Amino acid sequence: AMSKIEIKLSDIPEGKNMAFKWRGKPLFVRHRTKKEIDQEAAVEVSQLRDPQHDLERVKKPEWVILIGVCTHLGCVPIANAGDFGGYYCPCHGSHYDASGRIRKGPAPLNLEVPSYEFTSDDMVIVG
């Protein structure tokens, strides 16, 4: 079983972005704090290059799950870097927020949100 990955949530503490390998690429499972959740909720969406509310990019507010591949040219976004406390792609300087939305730099789109579901309070199944 490699098409779907099952991740134990209790292993990822608040504030941590945990990376896994899925379908040959990085997969990020990040436990967000109340502060991060509220900050993403405060974003004025009409000004975004790729407009989406934070709540249509996550199922549970305290968890953001993203494909760790920069939408510009494919490099790997670095967690807790950049001007928006989200991610930073060093290849050409794209800055993403904690929702994975593109906020500064050349990338054209928000980081991809894969298909996933929570099977219980402790597990999330991606794919």
Piece of 50-58, 65-73, 78-86, 108-116 that binds ligand FES (CB under 6 A) = 65-73
For residue 122, give Cα distances in angstroms to 11, 77, 113. Answer: 9, 26, 20
* Shortest spacing between CB 111 and ligand FES, in angstroms: 10
Residue 78 binding ligand FES, by CB under 6 A: no
Please give the size of the binding site for ligand FES, defined by CB under 6 A: 13
Beta bridge partners of 88: 78, 95
Q: Tell how strand 63-67 and strand 25-31 pair up.
A: antiparallel
Single out the residue of 69, 67, 82, 72 nearest to residue 113, CA to CA: 67
Q: Does 105 interact with ligand FES (rule: CB under 6 A)?
A: yes
Determine, following the binding rule CB under 6 A, whether residue 89 of this chain makes contact with ligand FES.
Answer: yes
Instruction: Say how far residue 41 (Cα) sits from the centre of its chain.
Output: 15
Among residues 51 and 74, whose Cβ is nearest to ligand FES? 74
Cα(104)–Cα(49) distance, integer angstroms: 9
- Asked if 95 is an active-site residue, the reply is no
List the binding residues for [2Fe-2S] cluster: 70, 72, 89, 92, 94
Residues that bind ligand FES (CB under 6 A): 70, 72-75, 89, 91-94, 105-107
